[PDB]
Swiss-Prot record, chain B:
Chain positions with N6-acetyllysine modification: K459
Protein name: Bifunctional glutamate/proline--tRNA ligase
Modified residues (Omega-N-methylarginine): R128
Organism of origin: Homo sapiens
Binding-site residues, ATP: R128, E130, R139, T140, Q213, T216, T252, R254
SUBUNIT field: Homodimer. Part of the aminoacyl-tRNA synthetase multienzyme complex, also know as multisynthetase complex (MSC), that is composed of the tRNA ligases for Arg (RARS1), Asp (DARS1), Gln (QARS1), Ile (IARS1), Leu (LARS1), Lys (KARS1), Met (MARS1) the bifunctional ligase for Glu and Pro (EPRS1) and the auxiliary subunits AIMP1/p43, AIMP2/p38 and EEF1E1/p18. Forms a linear complex that contains MARS1, EEF1E1, EPRS1 and AIMP2 that is at the core of the multisubunit complex. Interacts with TARS3. Interacts with DUS2L. Component of the GAIT complex which is composed of EPRS1, RPL13A and GAPDH.
High-level lineage: Eukaryota, Metazoa, Chordata, Craniata, Vertebrata
């Protein structure tokens, strides 16, 4: 069984859960982890959804090189200098030094935007809407954590270029809403949509929109996905331009966006829904939604029981429920109950001889442990209903927790008190970078780490009163901003 | 398209892959951008192969790209040596293939025979930093592939899988890409040194008279399980351990390059309907009649989508119809569906098939039926022509002189062969301006069976050729 308790040592519980659910295997290189099928399948579910949705918006998939030349990486002001010591450099092939070192992509702006500049020769060439599913590398020496913060990770990065600001601004919010759908509708995780402050936005962009999630077990928030409006900053840098004949003597620089989402998704799912029995899969992304286990197991009664289990399997498959029949003779029914509970399968379907003879079975929900006796004839109906109820239940519980842990404060003193209780706080804020630094410094100083901004919510809990001051007291508030201790 | 396939193939190829918007060049050599038109073909291959291996019980995963020095050493490898300006404690290698990352995990996952089989696949990128001359799709420094790695308790289930995977690869080439291939096994010289035997599919590119390996499926036997200690308890004998039997298999975007080299023509790319992102492109050729024509095009679009035909209506105002004809011809779209006002008012349309250029006039009410028929015929036609080509260019020669002569005509040859490494080296140096290498020992040779070296008897008919 799982013996680590989530409320006692969270980091050990997390390591136990991700390994005993067979999601993660550790590699011999720090910050690099093997995604076993149980975790990879969740990424595949997210991919299926998001891929279909961006195709509806006109985005097409592609694959750009993993390697960036020294010249291309350092040619334009695409990234702040603090990232320099975290680029992984290939310097030799076999035993002999390369003429010029080449970098592993940490993101693909510097490989994609020179090609965009080649491809945009007139108005007709826009828009360009490309996505790629790929791995990136950011070689930090801070402590890594499986799924949440790693050196190599899988993601998707979309990059779009448009003739007008309005088309681009529309896409930014559409993509952000798809990310919120990934978290809320697939993973049953509530998120807060907002704009990053000036300090936390992508430096080279116009503005950054974000979704923020809350991990109550650690009292910390974490960014779930991001959608940037780059404006014309990168088009001016890379000369992504066209000319209108109706406007002679003027360049038209493309308006650009970029957006990304990673396997961090899975880690947040694990941290939010996981419990002291192990992983808990939302039915929308569970590789296996129902596991059928023969229990209470004569020598032809046994064959009848096995055939009944396969009857349920085929009926469920027939109604698009993802189902596995664990018919292993080697393992005890208790062993199987435990194995699939650790893996978070939403429903265990128990079939024993007595129930078979009485044309019934037992369904056990993973989230609550509730057991239900179901008539055989209702199998497809009831189980679908139960799966839907599990999904809602998970979201509802997580939403309640966010509601208790995200609150309004209008003074530094109240903010400090609430923050130190392990919650995130919406405060009136002047938006200035220096003030944000001061908030981090003084909440660190006065705690009894510093708070960072998470986002400026699009829909704050309260509306800023006229003349309301920032918590710094010195400048008027520009907006309610969500702050907390962060991942 | 200006360049001609029959004169300057390399230039023809560069023009076709760029004007079809499949490839863009990168500022590092041997690395190429896969634009959507190319990537879509890879996605179609992936959809097929992924479904098929799932039916065999293979599960997808993702192992790390980085290999430690020690694990790798238990070679044109790209080495990471620093992060920023900070030298790493130890250099780490980019995977050229994932045996050395996967099999330590395999050895930890296998304790009893109940832990077998293990059947894992990953769709990923690998890196082989050679300085030989690269070619888009066909031979590149970084490439997308799938690598499957399986572990079993017995030799027999492993052997079964090797052959099933090779047949899936032959399905990818022959059924999806309309490319005939020759199944066989590699000679001692050419087989994977880390395995017991290597099965392969070989394809032929007549424009260069050269063969190319399309995919590969190895039986590794107990080589790697002895090296990495992938062991399980003997079910009958107390205390005794057995080593697992293993396979690995792989397939890359080389597929798309072979498809381009085989079916492409002097008008550009030619897509087999089974992998074409767009199978039919609808092109329009009084304000009321303008609106009605657009609506008719949209009718065809919706009807073809309703019958699961992949269709785009190019209703764009900012491009001439002739520009569209040429654009979608360069891209190899199998069928151009032309609707003009007169066609609309005659309840008919024109379908132009890309492979032959034939223009068919089709009654409107038959749109869904006939177009499906035409798509099927295009697929078959492509395959049939390619097979004709292969049969024309693969012949038996039972003596060296004829073999050399056959080879210099730009063909590949099945010869009686002894199998010895020394002899294969001698055939290479003799036939040299490259000398011929062995391609495979065909499962089904042209003729039933001494070597063409004389000094030895022939162990098998072997297919030899100048190879990519
Ligand atoms: C797994 C994962 C995810 C993400 N990030 C980033 C923001 C983002 C969001 N939202 C991306 C835009 C989509 C995200 O998920 C970032 C990372 N590694 C790193 O920072 C490097 C690293 C390595 C070791 C320790 C600490 C840090 N690792
Ligand atoms: C695109 C592609 C494909 C393949 N290979 C290999 C055999 C195989 C088959 N069949 C794999 C098992 C699946 C295949 O496709 C190999 C490659 N690059 C290389 O050798 C490196 C290289 C780079 C520049 C010049 C010369 C050589 N590049
Ligand atoms: O990667 C980004 C901005 C956006 N790029 C497209 C995908 C979504 C993503 O939010 C910001 N970023 C983040 N981390 C980086 C690390 C390094 Br090292 C470098 Cl060089 C550059 C960067 C860098 O540019
Ligand atoms: O990669 C292979 C053997 C098989 N691995 C699984 C996928 C299918 C493939 O045929 C052979 N191979 C090929 N090229 C290599 C290049 C280098 Br560099 C290294 Cl270290 C190792 C290798 C190496 O092992
Ligand atoms: Br980022
Ligand atoms: Br290989
Ligand atoms: Ca001006
Ligand atoms: Ca709390
Ligand atoms: Ca012994
Ligand atoms: Cl679902
Ligand atoms: Cl029934
Ligand atoms: Zn799975
Ligand atoms: Zn302030
Ligand atoms: Zn496409
Ligand atoms: Zn010989």
């Amino acid at each position: 069984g799982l013996e680590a308790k989530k409320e006692e040592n969270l980091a050990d519980w997390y390591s136990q859960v991700i390994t005993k659910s067979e999601m993660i295997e550790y590699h011999d290189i720090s910050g690099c982890y093997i995604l076993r099928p149980w975790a990879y399948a969740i990424w595949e579910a997210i991919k299926d959804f998001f891929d279909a949705e961006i195709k509806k918006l006109g985005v097409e998939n592609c694959y750009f090189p993993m390697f960036v030349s020294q010249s291309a990486l350092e040619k334009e002001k695409t990234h702040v200098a603090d990232f320099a010591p975290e680029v992984a450099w290939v310097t030799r092939s076999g035993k002999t030094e390369l003429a010029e070192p080449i970098a592993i992509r940490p993101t693909s702006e510097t490989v994609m935007y020179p090609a965009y500049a080649k491809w945009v020769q007139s108005h007709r060439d826009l828009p360009i809407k490309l996505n790629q599913w790929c791995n990136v590398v950011r070689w930090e020496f801070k402590h890594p954590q499986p799924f949440l913060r790693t050196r190599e990770f899988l993601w998707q990065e979309g990059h779009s270029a448009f003739a007008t600001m309005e088309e681009a601004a529309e896409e930014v919010l559409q993509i952000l809403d798809l990310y919120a759908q990934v978290y809320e509708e697939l993973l049953a995780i509530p998120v807060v949509k907002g704009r990053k402050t000036e300090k936390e936005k992508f430096a080279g962009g116009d503005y950054t929109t974000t979704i923020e999630a809350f991990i109550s077990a650690s009292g910390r928030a974490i960014q779930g996905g991001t959608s940037h409006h780059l404006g014309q900053n990168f088009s001016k840098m890379f000369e992504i331009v066209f000319e209108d004949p109706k406007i002679p003597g003027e360049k038209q620089f493309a308006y650009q966006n970029s957006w990304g989402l990673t396997t961090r998704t899975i880690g947040v799912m694990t941290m939010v829904h996981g419990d002291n029995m192990g992983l808990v899969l939302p039915p929308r992304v569970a590789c296996v939604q129902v596991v059928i286990i023969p229990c209470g197991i004569s020598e032809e009664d046994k064959e009848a029981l096995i055939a009944k289990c396969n009857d349920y399997r085929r009926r469920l498959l027939s109604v698009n429920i993802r189902v596995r029949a664990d018919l292993r003779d080697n393992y005890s029914p208790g062993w199987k109950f435990n194995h699939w509970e650790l893996k978070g399968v939403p429903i265990r379907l128990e079939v024993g001889p007595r129930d078979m003879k009485s044309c019934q079975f037992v369904a056990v929900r993973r989230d609550t442990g509730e057991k239900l006796t179901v008539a055989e004839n209702e199998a497809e109906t009831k189980l679908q209903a139960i799966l839907e109820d599990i999904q809602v239940t998970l979201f509802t519980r997580a939403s309640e927790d966010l509601k208790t842990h995200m609150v309004v404060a209008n003074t530094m003193e109240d903010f400090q008190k609430i923050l130190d209780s392990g919650k995130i706080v919406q405060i009136p804020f002047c938006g200035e970078i220096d003030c944000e630094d001061w908030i981090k410094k003084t909440t660190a100083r006065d705690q009894d780490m510093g708070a960072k901004s998470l986002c400026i919510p699009f829909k704050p809990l309260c509306e800023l009163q006229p003349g309301a001051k920032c918590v710094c007291g010195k400048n008027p508030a520009k907006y309610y901003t969500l702050f907390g201790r962060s991942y």
